């Protein structure tokens, strides 16, 4: 299936996904069981090897990973491609005997779709775990942002900026690659626009902090405003970050996790 919910996963399974459409499209007209195809004992031996490596890696991915969802969603994707691969092999034999078998073409098709489908699930499941890595980072920035309300000195400000800076950088780099892989404009825009705002406001949030931490130091000066202006940027940025979490959340949540 067109389970290409990513621009990379798409560019990977698209080419072969097309060829499969033909086989089904042609096998429907009766033009598939037509030709007497050569020996697929060599090529089918390749995919059988290719699938073994894919499965192997996926098995390791689960081994290492800390993501419990990916830990329990990957294994099946393995089984899928694994037995869909056997149908592929079977068809190769059926054809090695009779290059005209229409049921061999049935397996030849059902198997190709199983390989392409399983591969999709595999990648998609893995990717969704990567999206949760982003969500985590964002949820981290969200937390520290509130810490900006307890900063009462220049030394605190120095520390705060030193900390926010890095995470602010990581989530910025993560959202960058992220928006590129998206397959829907609307999402990409929000993701991009929202992250930009966060970038725009960061220096503003630091100003509001310096002004406050200073005006408060400059004792005997209007401070109910500096506070309000600092708490606003904190709120604005926090809101933008939630739109990001929400978007990333909408574009990856596979409901087997309830």
């Amino acid at each position: 299936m067109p389970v290409f919910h990513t621009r990379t996963i798409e560019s990977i399974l698209e080419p072969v996904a097309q060829q499969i459409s033909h086989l089904v499209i042609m096998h429907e007209e009766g033009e598939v069981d037509g030709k007497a195809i050569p020996d697929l004992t060599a090529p089918v031996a390749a995919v059988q090897a290719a699938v073994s490596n894919l499965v192997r890696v996926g098995k390791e991915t689960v081994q290492t990973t800390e993501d419990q969802i990916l830990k329990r969603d990957m294994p099946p994707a393995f089984i899928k491609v694994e037995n869909a691969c056997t149908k592929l092999v079977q068809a190769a034999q059926m054809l090695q005997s009779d290059p005209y078998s229409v049921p061999a073409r049935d397996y030849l098709i059902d198997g190709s779709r199983g390989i392409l489908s399983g591969t999709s699930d595999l990648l998609l499941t893995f990717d969704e775990a990567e999206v949760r890595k982003i969500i985590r980072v964002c949820k981290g920035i969200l937390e520290y942002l509130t810490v900006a309300e307890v900063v009462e000195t220049m030394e605190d400000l120095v520390t705060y900026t030193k900390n926010l800076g890095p995470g602010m950088t990581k989530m910025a780099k993560m959202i960058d690659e992220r928006q590129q892989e998206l397959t829907h404009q609307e999402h990409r825009v929000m993701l991009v626009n929202s992250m930009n705002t966060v970038k725009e406001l960061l220096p503003v949030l630091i100003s509001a902090m310096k002004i406050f931490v200073t005006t408060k130091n400059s004792k005997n000066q209007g401070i109910e405003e500096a506070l309000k202006n600092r708490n606003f940027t904190v709120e604005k940025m926090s809101a933008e970050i939630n739109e990001i979490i929400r978007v990333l959340q909408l574009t990856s949540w596979d409901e087997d996790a309830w």
Binding site: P15, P38, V47, A49, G58, T119
Partner: peptide, 25 residues
Amino acid sequence: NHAIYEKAKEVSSALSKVLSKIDDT
């Protein structure tokens, strides 16, 4: 990890060769 995509390209390629070995006319 970022290999899963590697092996995925290999199975996506093998399946391709097999499919195109049935394509001709």
